[PDB]
A paper describes a structure:
A conserved feature of Polyomavirus T-antigens is a phenylalanine situated at the C-termini of their origin-binding domains (OBDs). T-ag is the only virally encoded protein needed for replication; therefore, it has been the target of numerous studies designed to understand its multiple roles during the duplication of the viral genome. One of the interesting findings of the JCV T-ag OBD structure was the presence of a C-terminal "pocket". This structure also revealed that the pocket serves as the binding site for T-ag residues from the A1/B2 loops situated on a neighboring OBD subunit. The initial function of the A1 and B2 loops is site-specific DNA binding to the viral origin.
JCV T-ag containing the F258L mutation, which is located in the C-terminus of the OBD, was unable to support T-ag dependent JCV DNA replication. The F258L JCV T-ag OBD crystallized in the I41 space group, diffracted to 2.7 Å and contained one molecule in the asymmetric unit cell. As with the wt JCV OBD, the topology of the OBD F258L mutant is a five-stranded antiparallel B-sheet sandwiched, on either side, by two helices. The A1 loop is the "DNA free" or "apo-conformation" (; reviewed in). Inspection of Fig 4B establishes that the previously described C-terminal pocket is also a feature of the JCV T-ag OBD F258L mutant. The crystallography experiments establish that the overall structures of the apo forms of the wt and F258L JCV T-ag OBDs are quite similar and that the structural consequences of the F258L mutation appear to be localized to the pocket. For example, the H-bond formed between N259 and R155 is lost and many non-bonded interactions made between the C-terminus and the A1 and B2 motifs are altered. Moreover, L258 causes disruptions to many of the non-bonded interactions and the L258 mutation also causes the loss (e.g., N259-R155) and acquisition (e.g., D257-F152) of several hydrogen bonds. That the changes are localized to the pocket, and not transmitted to other regions of the JCV T-ag OBD, is supported by the observation that the F258L mutation has little to no impact on A1 and B2 loop dependent site-specific binding to duplex DNA.
Residue numbers in the entry: 133 to 259
């Protein structure tokens, strides 16, 4: 009932709303439970050989942010993520603003719980 219908409003700027689009992208964000995000963190690594992935706390919920070496459809990533939820909510969107989205997720009200590279992203890695 009180499950979020979208990402927090302060992150909407960094996100594509075209969840059914045909355009393949390489930057993704997932909003779900801490339970489901803890699971997807590793499963996405082995599914999409992600170049970077980071997990970010927000109250009880989590935001996963990841980059893939090949482009994918957002609907494809979401479909995979939806398999590993059942009754848990899950919001999956393409990220149009990679290092800035990430930096918002590294500051209040968010916090980085874990990430696949020590020190996380450097802005020069994306540029």
């Amino acid at each position: 009932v009180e499950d979020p219908k979208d990402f927090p409003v302060d992150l909407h700027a960094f996100l594509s709303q075209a969840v059914f689009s045909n355009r393949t992208v390489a930057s993704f964000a997932v909003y779900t439970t801490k339970e489901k995000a803890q699971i997807l963190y590793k499963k996405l690594m082995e599914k999409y050989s992600v170049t970077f992935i980071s997990r970010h706390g927000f109250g009880g919920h989590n935001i996963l942010f990841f980059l893939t070496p090949h482009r994918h459809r957002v609907s494809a990533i979401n479909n995979y993520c939806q398999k590993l939820c059942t009754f848990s909510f899950l919001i999956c969107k393409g990220v149009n603003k990679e290092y800035l989205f990430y930096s918002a997720l590294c500051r209040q009200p968010y916090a980085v719980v874990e990430e696949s590279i020590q020190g996380g992203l450097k802005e020069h890695d994306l540029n």
